[PDB]
Amino acid sequence: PDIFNRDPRDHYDLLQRLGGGTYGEVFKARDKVSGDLVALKMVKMEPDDDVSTLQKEILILKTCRHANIVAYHGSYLWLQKLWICMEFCGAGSLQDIYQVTGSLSELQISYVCREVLQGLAYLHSQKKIHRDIKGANILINDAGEVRLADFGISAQIGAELARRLEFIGTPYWMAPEVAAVALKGGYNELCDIWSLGITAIELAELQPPLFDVHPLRVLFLMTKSGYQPPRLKEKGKWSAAFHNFIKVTLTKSPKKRPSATKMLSHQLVSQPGLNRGLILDLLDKLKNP
Amino acid sequence: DIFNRDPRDHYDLLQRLGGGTYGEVFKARDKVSGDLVALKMVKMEPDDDVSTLQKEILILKTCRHANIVAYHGSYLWLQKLWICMEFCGAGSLQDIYQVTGSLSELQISYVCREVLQGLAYLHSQKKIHRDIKGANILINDAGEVRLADFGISAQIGAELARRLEFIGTPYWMAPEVAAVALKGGYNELCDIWSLGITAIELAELQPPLFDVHPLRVLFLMTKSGYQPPRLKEKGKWSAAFHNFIKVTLTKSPKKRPSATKMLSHQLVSQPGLNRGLILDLLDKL
Ligand SMILES: COc1cc2c(cc1Nc1ncc(C(N)=O)c(Nc3ccccc3Br)n1)CN(C)CC2
Ligand SMILES: COc1cc2c(cc1Nc1ncc(C(N)=O)c(Nc3ccccc3Br)n1)CN(C)CC2
């Protein structure tokens, strides 16, 4: 792992803020001599966080090398601040893109979905769960390539971890099975596949299904026994293969829902002519209308 | 029957009792008769459904169990629900033990019996308390024991808005993930565990691991070789209290005894458990 106990503002000039909230800030940063653009995730560290196991996640991040997951370059630890230096994806998220470009073509969506599934197939074989597949978290570089973020080690510490404890409340009276669920949730690996199903509709239609309907109402509808999963609005615009991809990804029963590996042999995503050219056309549409 | 009327017409709000996520709670006097009640003010927001709200209130009205705080009525003035309830004048057992110090084994056994009677009722009504602790076991001036009810108040207002904010946008969330985000791992038998820990709390002024960080406690509890808590001072307490703690604090939920099963346990089925034990406590003040 080797977290360098040094100020990263010495080594990179922070150009521009990209986003943040609970986890911390993410900046666009230039490598001072070499001119390489990176993403610096500044994480707020707090005194009761273990530095020993923190390095073991960073060791997993270093030894990991999958193409559809954002690359880890290195760690700095200056004044109660972990800085995770990462790959920069210069076009932003697909949300940032679609809000300017409008809806993606079926081919563009098919390529995105294949690249996400390759990322999800890798994370699940490493016993991890993404937990948050949406348009806003699928990043696009200038080459038209597709990258997932990784909120793995950032979830285990800091202000996002303190947020997850604050709603849970004092744990001292809580039973073991209640505490088990308070850590995990209902999140297993296959919920990412559902979430991709919703994402593909989002990219298709500029919104996930029920986005105009109250969050609670949606939660109750989802849980009630005869909940029909969502579908694409405009049947004729999309091919049968896209409809089937949405049907099978949005299987209600987790036991019966296909895994990332199973999904990569689906017609929509195994078809030829799916490559980054499709996204270069999209990024061109962002510049030239 | 939610009365579309101002409750400040019918009651004088005397004094604030505390708290504020679930709602703010005032001690209130009935204007003519002088009867004391507890009024829980909840701040409501415009997209809260009044239809199913009445069905919980209908279950609360038709309910008449003695160990659960009694529901008197609901009032709805300007985007503010006010839930009129039974008053318990001695406060919570936490408020009490912070002045009195530790309860005797007999006092604890009486509290435990009255809570289990409440929990046996709630579980037969398919509900779960979710929050059995010293601070939520109330004591009236008669020495009697009442559980609170954060049932319908959890389904609306600022506590409902908080539960949505941490869960985050549900639109991308899978059904099984949403199911767990509503329920939790709360089943009925977690209240029995929670009472087990409450009995220790009453015994020792703190739950077990109170000086250990919340996260560390959550990870310890979940890891495979987690030993449940026990009482510190073996000699001070009887074997029956130790067994009550051992069986209530069973890790495996399938093997952990229900409220009904627990009421026929030795500690709480013994004679001489009555409100006199708590009158002695309230007298120590
Ligand atoms: C020109 O590059 C960008 C423009 C914009 C956005 C993102 C980028 N690039 C970008 N590249 C790489 C990463 C990375 N290694 O993780 C990243 N992370 C990130 C950013 C914001 C929040 C959380 C995270 Br995690 N972001 C995000 N949008 C919301 C506004 C525009
Ligand atoms: C002299 O009576 C009291 C003194 C005090 C406390 C409680 C009481 N009595 C009391 N009786 C009944 C209820 C009820 N129908 O629910 C209640 N509600 C309540 C009050 C505060 C918070 C949450 C809730 Br629910 N409160 C609470 N303590 C923390 C500080 C002092």
Side-chain angles (χ1 to χ4, degrees):
Chain A
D2 220 61
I3 298 160
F4 309 111
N5 287 124
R6 194 158 276 280
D7 197 347
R9 276 185 79 75
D10 302 338
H11 295 190
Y12 309 89
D13 290 327
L14 301 183
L15 298 183
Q16 185 192 287
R17 188 181 170 262
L18 307 179
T22 54
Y23 49 87
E25 310 298 307
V26 176
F27 299 97
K28 178 185 177 185
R30 204 206 312 285
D31 210 309
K32 198 167 160 186
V33 186
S34 71
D36 307 27
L37 301 171
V38 298
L40 270 176
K41 182 168 177 184
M42 179 192 81
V43 186
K44 179 180 164 182
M45 195 145 281
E46 296 180 41
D48 61 276
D49 293 30
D50 298 306
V51 301
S52 188
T53 52
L54 179 60
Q55 290 191 125
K56 292 203 173 187
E57 270 280 30
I58 291 159
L59 182 55
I60 292 158
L61 289 171
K62 201 168 188 179
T63 54
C64 166
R65 301 189 183 187
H66 200 275
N68 300 120
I69 311 302
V70 155
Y72 167 78
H73 302 331
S75 289
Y76 295 78
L77 180 54
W78 207 230
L79 297 160
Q80 303 294 341
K81 282 197 192 67
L82 177 66
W83 299 78
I84 311 167
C85 190
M86 293 178 291
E87 185 185 342
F88 184 58
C89 303
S93 78
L94 284 164
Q95 190 177 111
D96 305 325
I97 292 159
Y98 75 62
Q99 289 170 151
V100 184
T101 64
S103 60
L104 278 51
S105 68
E106 191 179 317
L107 290 170
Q108 287 163 333
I109 293 163
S110 306
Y111 169 75
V112 167
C113 291
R114 192 196 70 197
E115 300 309 287
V116 175
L117 288 161
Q118 288 160 189
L120 293 169
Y122 175 73
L123 295 174
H124 301 171
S125 62
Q126 302 291 307
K127 316 300 190 156
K128 300 179 197 133
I129 306 164
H130 195 277
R131 302 183 166 75
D132 210 348
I133 294 290
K134 56 178 178 181
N137 295 352
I138 294 164
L139 300 175
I140 299 297
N141 71 8
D142 313 79
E145 309 186 291
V146 185
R147 299 278 175 283
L148 304 167
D150 203 27
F151 304 91
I153 195 45
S154 62
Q156 294 272 58
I157 46 160
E160 197 172 44
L161 190 269
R163 194 183 174 179
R164 182 175 295 285
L165 267 47
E166 275 173 46
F167 176 58
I168 291 169
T170 49
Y172 306 111
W173 294 270
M174 194 169 273
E177 77 283 19
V178 182
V181 176
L183 291 176
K184 298 162 186 172
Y187 287 105
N188 72 314
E189 75 276 346
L190 303 174
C191 74
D192 296 326
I193 306 297
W194 178 281
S195 294
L196 178 65
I198 301 295
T199 305
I201 295 166
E202 168 202 8
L203 300 177
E205 308 183 356
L206 316 183
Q207 313 155 58
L210 311 150
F211 197 69
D212 65 336
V213 183
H214 193 260
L216 188 59
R217 210 181 302 287
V218 174
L219 292 162
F220 278 120
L221 284 160
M222 279 189 294
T223 53
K224 282 162 187 175
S225 58
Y227 180 56
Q228 290 302 136
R231 293 166 175 187
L232 292 147
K233 275 161 187 172
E234 306 195 299
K235 310 316 172 184
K237 193 176 176 167
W238 315 107
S239 74
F242 193 9
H243 290 300
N244 188 267
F245 178 92
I246 295 301
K247 184 175 166 175
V248 303
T249 51
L250 307 184
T251 305
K252 197 202 171 168
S253 188
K255 292 159 185 172
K256 298 178 181 178
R257 194 185 301 155
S259 64
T261 307
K262 286 177 228 154
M263 284 309 306
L264 284 167
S265 75
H266 197 275
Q267 173 188 353
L268 194 72
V269 294
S270 69
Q271 71 183 295
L274 296 177
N275 63 75
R276 72 199 188 83
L278 297 166
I279 308 304
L280 290 171
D281 274 18
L282 191 64
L283 300 179
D284 172 68
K285 202 186 169 175
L286 193 161
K287 305 174 226 144
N288 291 52
Chain B
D1 212 56
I2 298 160
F3 308 120
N4 186 234
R5 182 153 275 276
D6 198 340
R8 275 157 274 97
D9 297 345
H10 290 203
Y11 302 90
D12 288 304
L13 300 170
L14 306 179
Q15 193 185 306
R16 175 163 269 180
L17 296 178
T21 312
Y22 47 84
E24 315 297 316
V25 182
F26 304 97
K27 181 181 173 180
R29 199 214 313 286
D30 205 329
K31 280 196 196 291
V32 188
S33 72
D35 296 45
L36 298 167
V37 298
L39 268 173
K40 182 169 173 172
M41 183 207 73
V42 191
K43 190 174 181 190
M44 283 190 75
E45 288 151 49
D47 60 81
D48 295 21
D49 298 306
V50 303
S51 294
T52 52
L53 175 55
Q54 287 202 128
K55 293 199 173 187
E56 266 273 40
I57 286 161
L58 187 63
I59 294 157
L60 285 167
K61 202 167 182 182
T62 56
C63 171
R64 306 185 189 184
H65 199 84
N67 298 123
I68 311 302
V69 155
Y71 170 73
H72 301 331
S74 289
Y75 301 81
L76 184 60
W77 216 232
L78 299 167
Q79 296 290 345
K80 281 190 183 68
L81 186 75
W82 293 78
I83 309 168
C84 179
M85 306 170 284
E86 189 183 340
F87 184 63
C88 306
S92 78
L93 286 169
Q94 188 165 109
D95 306 325
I96 293 157
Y97 74 61
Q98 288 177 166
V99 181
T100 64
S102 60
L103 278 56
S104 64
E105 191 180 307
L106 292 167
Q107 288 165 328
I108 290 161
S109 305
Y110 168 75
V111 166
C112 290
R113 194 195 67 198
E114 298 311 287
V115 174
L116 289 160
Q117 285 160 188
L119 293 174
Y121 175 73
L122 286 162
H123 302 170
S124 62
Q125 301 292 317
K126 317 301 173 186
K127 287 170 178 185
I128 312 163
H129 196 278
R130 305 175 156 74
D131 211 349
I132 295 288
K133 52 185 285 223
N136 301 341
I137 296 168
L138 307 180
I139 303 297
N140 68 11
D141 314 78
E144 311 180 296
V145 185
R146 303 274 174 285
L147 299 167
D149 212 54
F150 305 91
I152 196 45
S153 66
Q155 294 272 300
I156 47 157
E159 196 172 42
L160 185 272
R162 186 62 171 179
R163 189 177 292 271
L164 273 35
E165 277 182 327
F166 179 58
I167 288 169
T169 48
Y171 310 111
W172 295 267
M173 203 184 285
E176 77 285 13
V177 178
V180 177
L182 293 179
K183 193 76 177 180
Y186 293 101
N187 72 314
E188 73 264 12
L189 302 166
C190 75
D191 293 331
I192 305 297
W193 177 281
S194 293
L195 181 64
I197 299 297
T198 305
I200 291 165
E201 172 199 5
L202 299 181
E204 311 185 350
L205 316 188
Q206 305 302 347
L209 315 155
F210 199 67
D211 66 332
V212 184
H213 196 260
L215 183 74
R216 295 213 188 77
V217 181
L218 292 157
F219 279 110
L220 285 160
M221 280 191 297
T222 52
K223 282 175 184 165
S224 60
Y226 181 60
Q227 302 309 133
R230 303 172 195 193
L231 291 153
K232 286 173 190 174
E233 307 194 318
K234 298 327 179 188
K236 192 179 187 192
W237 316 107
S238 73
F241 192 12
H242 291 303
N243 188 267
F244 178 92
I245 298 300
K246 183 162 165 184
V247 305
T248 52
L249 309 181
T250 305
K251 197 192 177 178
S252 193
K254 291 163 186 172
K255 298 173 189 174
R256 196 189 305 124
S258 64
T260 306
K261 289 186 198 177
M262 284 310 303
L263 282 157
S264 74
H265 192 272
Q266 182 170 20
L267 194 68
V268 296
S269 68
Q270 73 192 324
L273 296 176
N274 62 72
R275 72 206 184 83
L277 297 163
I278 305 305
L279 290 172
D280 268 35
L281 192 67
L282 296 193
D283 178 65
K284 196 178 184 183
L285 292 182

